[PDB]
Amino acid sequence: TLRAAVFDLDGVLALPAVFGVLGRTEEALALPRGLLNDAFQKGGPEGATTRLMKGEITLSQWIPLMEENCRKCSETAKVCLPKNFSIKEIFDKAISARKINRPMLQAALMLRKKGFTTAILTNTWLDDRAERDGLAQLMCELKMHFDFLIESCQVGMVKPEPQIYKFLLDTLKASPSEVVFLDDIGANLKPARDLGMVTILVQDTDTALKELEKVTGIQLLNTPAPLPTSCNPSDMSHGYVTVKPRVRLHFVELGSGPAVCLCHGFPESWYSWRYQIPALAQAGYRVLAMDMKGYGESSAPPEIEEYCMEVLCKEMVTFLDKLGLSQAVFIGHDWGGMLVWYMALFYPERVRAVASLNTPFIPANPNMSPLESIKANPVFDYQLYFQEPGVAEAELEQNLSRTFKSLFRASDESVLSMHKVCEAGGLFVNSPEEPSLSRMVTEEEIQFYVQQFKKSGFRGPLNWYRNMERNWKWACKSLGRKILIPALMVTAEKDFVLVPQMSQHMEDWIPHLKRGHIEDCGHWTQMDKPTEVNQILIKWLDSDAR
Amino acid sequence: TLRAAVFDLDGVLALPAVFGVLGRTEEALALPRGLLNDAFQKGGPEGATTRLMKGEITLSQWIPLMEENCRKCSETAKVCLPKNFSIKEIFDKAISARKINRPMLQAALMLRKKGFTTAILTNTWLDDRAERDGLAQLMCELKMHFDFLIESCQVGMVKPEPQIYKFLLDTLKASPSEVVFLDDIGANLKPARDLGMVTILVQDTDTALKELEKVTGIQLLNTPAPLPTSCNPSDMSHGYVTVKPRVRLHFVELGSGPAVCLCHGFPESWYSWRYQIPALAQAGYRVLAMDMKGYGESSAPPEIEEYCMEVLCKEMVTFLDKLGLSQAVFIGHDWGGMLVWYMALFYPERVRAVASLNTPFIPANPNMSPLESIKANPVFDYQLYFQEPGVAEAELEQNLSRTFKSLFRASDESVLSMHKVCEAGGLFVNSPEEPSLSRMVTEEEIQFYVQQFKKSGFRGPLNWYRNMERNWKWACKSLGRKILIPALMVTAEKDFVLVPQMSQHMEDWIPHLKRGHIEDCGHWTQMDKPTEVNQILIKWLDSDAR
Numbered sequence A, B: 001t002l003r004a005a006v007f008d009l010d011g012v013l014a015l016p017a018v019f020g021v022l023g024r025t026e027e028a029l030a031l032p033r034g035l036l037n038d039a040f041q042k043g044g045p046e047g048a049t050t051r052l053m054k055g056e057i058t059l060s061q062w063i064p065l066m067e068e069n070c071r072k073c074s075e076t077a078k079v080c081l082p083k084n085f086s087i088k089e090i091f092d093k094a095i096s097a098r099k100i101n102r103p104m105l106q107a108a109l110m111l112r113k114k115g116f117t118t119a120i121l122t123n124t125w126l127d128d129r130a131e132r133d134g135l136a137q138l139m140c141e142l143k144m145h146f147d148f149l150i151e152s153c154q155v156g157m158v159k160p161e162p163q164i165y166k167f168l169l170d171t172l173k174a175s176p177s178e179v180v181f182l183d184d185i186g187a188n189l190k191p192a193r194d195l196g197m198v199t200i201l202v203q204d205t206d207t208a209l210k211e212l213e214k215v216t217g218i219q220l221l222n223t224p225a226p227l228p229t230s231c232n233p234s235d236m237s238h239g240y241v242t243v244k245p246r247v248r249l250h251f252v253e254l255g256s257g258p259a260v261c262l263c264h265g266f267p268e269s270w271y272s273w274r275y276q277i278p279a280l281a282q283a284g285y286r287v288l289a290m291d292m293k294g295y296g297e298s299s300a301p302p303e304i305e306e307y308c309m310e311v312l313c314k315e316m317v318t319f320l321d322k323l324g325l326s327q328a329v330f331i332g333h334d335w336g337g338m339l340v341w342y343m344a345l346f347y348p349e350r351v352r353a354v355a356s357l358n359t360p361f362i363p364a365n366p367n368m369s370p371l372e373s374i375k376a377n378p379v380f381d382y383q384l385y386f387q388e389p390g391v392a393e394a395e396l397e398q399n400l401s402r403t404f405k406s407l408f409r410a411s412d413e414s415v416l417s418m419h420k421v422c423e424a425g426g427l428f429v430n431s432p433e434e435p436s437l438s439r440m441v442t443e444e445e446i447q448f449y450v451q452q453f454k455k456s457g458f459r460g461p462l463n464w465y466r467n468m469e470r471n472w473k474w475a476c477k478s479l480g481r482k483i484l485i486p487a488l489m490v491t492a493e494k495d496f497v498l499v500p501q502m503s504q505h506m507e508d509w510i511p512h513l514k515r516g517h518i519e520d521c522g523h524w525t526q527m528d529k530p531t532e533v534n535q536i537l538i539k540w541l542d543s544d545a546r
Ligand SMILES: Cn1cccc1-c1cc(F)c2c(c1)C(C)(C)C(=O)N2
Pocket: A266, A267, A334, A382, A407, A414, A416, A418, A427, A494, A495, A496, A497, A498, A522, A523
C-alpha cells in the first residue's frame, strides 16, 4: 500500500520545463535539431552539467562551459551559432517563464492531506545569477507544501545514479513498493521502477493525475475548489513589542514588501486571518497579524479606559514606531474595522491605505448620546448586554468550547437569536450545550481559540464595547474631516448585524472609496469566504497600496 | 535650575522652514512681498490655517481654502497669480526639501544624556497627501530622540494660545522657570516668556546653541563627535522562529526595506550590533539582528554536532523560509563572518549579498587536517584551548562580569595574552580579578551580556569551535566553487588574530570582492569603530544590495 509520493520539479511541479526551451531555441534560431540539448548533456557523468547538478560548480561558473560545448557541437554539425548567441539570456528567460504547475501542486496537497508523506526530488543547481531571486521565490512557495525537498546540488548525487534513490527511500523512511514517483524523464524513472516503486511518466498533467488517482485510490481530478493555505501557529515567526510599561503587543509575521497590518474583531485572534496570511505574503506583502490588546499573547489590563479608541490607536502608532515602520496598510474586521477607520482619521500619515471587512465608517452623531443611538437599532442589543462588567464575562468564560462553537457559524447555521439578548438573559440561552461543529471550522481550530482565551478570558475583549461615551467625544473632534487616503469597504451579504445597507452613506466621508462585496457571507468573513476575501484584498492592495 | 528643553519643529529641529518657502515662492514668481504669507495666515484664529493646525480639517481639505485665500489677496493687491499656480506643488516641494537640523538634534540629544526631559512642541497638520510618507519618516526619525512630542492637530490647540503652554508644562511635570523653550517665531515665544520660561529665538542655529549652552551650562557646541544611536533592549521588537522541534531562534527587528540579517560572533549577542541596528534601519533596510544558536534567547542544545556549519546554515535557511523571505543580505562578524561566507557558497539563491567584518574567507585545505592547520599559527592557540569540553566553560562561567570586561577591550587595553593559552592554563590567568571598564563599553552594557549568558552559559557558544573535522569535510565539497554574488570584506588594522593580511588571497575565490578597512580597530569592530562600520556598510548596501 502506497504512503509516499515523490515529485520531480522541472516538467512536473513546474512548467514549462527547461529542456523544452533548449528545443524551442533550436527551432527559433533554425539550429540543427538537438544541438543545444546535445551540448547541455555533453560528457555525460563526466560533463560540465553533471558537475553543476552535483554542486561542484555554480550556475555562473557553468555558463561559459556550456558556451564551449555549444561551439564544439556546432563545429561538428558544420553549422554556425548566431552573432548574438547567449546561454545566459536563454536560461534567464526559461527560469523566469517557469511557473508552478497548479493542478500538480493541488494533487500533492490532497495526497499529504490524506496522510501521504510528500517530497520533491530534483536535479538542480547552485544559482548565483544576478536574477536568482525569481527561482528562490518559486522554490520557497513550493517547498512549504512538502515534507521533504531533496536537491542534487546539496546531496552531491544526481538522478539517474542509484544512490540518490536509496537516499530518497532512507529520507522517506519507506520501502520502495510504498512510494509513487513522478518524473517527465523516462531514464530518471528507470532506477525507481528497478527498486520496485510505482512510477508515472509525466507528459501532460491530466494523464499523469489520472494514473496517480488510479494507483492511490484518492480523487485528485475534478475535486471541489480547495481552501487557501492556512497557518500552523508553531511554524510562524512570533513578534512582541512593548508599547508602554504594562502593555506588550503580539503579532505573527510573514513575507516581504509593504507592511500590511491585520486587525481582528471580537472575540477573535491573529488566527482569524489564518487564510489571508500566506496569500498576502505570496502576493508580495509583509504581513503583521495582530493579537489586538486584550487578546492572546498581547497584554490584557483590566481597566475599561485602556480599551478606548484613542488609547488603542496611540498604541498602534507606538507599535509602528518601535518596529521602525513609517507606515502600514491597515486592514480591520468587526472592532478591528472600527479601529482602522479611526487610524485613517487621526493618523493618516501612518496609514498607507485602509480597508474594513463588514464594519462601515459611521461618523459620531454630536446631537445624540451614543447609548441612545445603539438603542435605536434592535440588532445592536448584544452591545447593550456587553455593558455591565462581569455579566457577559461569566457567560462567555463558562464553557470556552461552547462559546466559540456557538459564535463561529455560517449564516445558515446560527443558534444565536441576537434579538432581545438582555431580556433573554444571555447570548446562549437558546443555544445547545454541545453545539455541532460549523462547516467553517475544525475541532482543532476551535481548540486554538479555546487555548488563547484561557490566558486572559473576556474582560479585555468586552472592554472594547465599554467606551461608548469616551469614543463618541474623541470621534466628534474628527467631524470636519474626510478620509482621503486609499480606502476599501468590503460588505458581507449575510451579516445580519453589520448589514451592507449600513455602509451606504460612506462616500459622503470617503469620496474616493473603493468597494468589494461578498455574497452568501456571514459575520466571520475571513473564514466564511477566504478565497473571495483574498481575491478582493490582493486586487485592491496591488492597485491602491503598491 | 533648568531640567527641561522644548523645541519647535519648523525652523528649529527641521530646516528649511515652510514660511521661508512662502517668501521664496513670492520672489521666484515676482509676486507682491508677503502675499502668500498673508493668504496663509488669513482670518487669524478664525481662519483655515488655524482649523488645519487644530486638526479640524486635513491638509488635503485645506489646500483649496488656501487657493481661495491666495485669489482674495491677489484681487486686493491688484495683481494676478500665474497660469500654473499650485499650492499642492509648492507644499510638496517644501515638505520634501525640509531635513533634520543635525546640530540642533545633537544638542537636544546631549541635554537628554545629561538628565534633561526633552520635548517637541509643534503647530502641525493631519497629512493625507499622496506623498505624506516623507514627513511620516522625518517625524519618526526625530520623535524617538525625545521624551514627548506634542502636536497641535492632536491636542486641538495651537501656539500662541495660552492653554497649549499650560498643557506642555503639565506634560513635562515641571514649573515654568525649569524650562528652556526654543522657537523661530517670536509671537510663539511670548506666552512661554510670560509664564516665566527661558526662551530662545532661533534665527541661525549656531547663535541659538550659544544661548542654550550659556543658560544650561552644558557644552553643546564644539563637542567631540557623538557615537551612533544605540538600542534599548526593552524598546525593540523581539522575534521568535522555531526552526526545528528543539530549536528556536530569537532576533531583534527594526525598519523596512530589503532584509539585512546580522550574525554576531563569539561570545556575543544580537546586542553586539546595537550601534548598527538604528543606522541600517534609517538607511532604508529591514534589520534582523540574531541571537545565533547557543546564545541569548535562542535555543542552546548541548550536543557538539548541533553547531557544525552545515546544521547552522540549514537552520538559517529554515529561518528565512518561516519568515517568508526568499533572500536576505547576510552580514557576519567573527564566527558569524565564517557562517555568512558558507551561506554564500551553499545557498547563493537565498543570499542577496554577503559581508564579513574581520573574518576572511579561507578555503579548506584538502591535503591537511584542520587540527594541523590551526596548530601552524600561534595566534589560534585559544581555539585549541576551546577544544576540550568543560575546560573553557569553567573559566568563562566562573565570573561573567570578569569574562566580558576582560574580553571586550580596545587594541590598546587588552589584558589577554593569546600566546600559549593552553600552556598558561587559561585566557584570564594573567588578567585582573576586577578588570577596569574598557572605553568601548558602559557597566550597563557589560551587565546585559552577563544577564544573557546566565541562561545557557558557554557550552553552545564553545561548540561552534568543536566541529573542525565536520566543517572541513563539508567545506571540501565547495572547493570547485567561486563566490560570485555581491561581497564585502572589512578588515580591522589592530585585530591581532584575524589580521588584515589573512584576507589577501580572497580575490582568487571572490573575483568581484569589494573591500573596507578600519584603522585603529581591534577585534570588537561594531563597538570599537561604530561610526566607521556604519559608513562602510551603508555605502556598500546602497551600491550592491539595493
Ligand atoms: C461579534 N459578536 C459577538 C457576539 C455576537 C456577535 C455577532 C456580531 C455580528 F455583527 C453578527 C453576528 C454576531 C451574527 C453572526 C449574528 C451576524 O450575522 N452578525
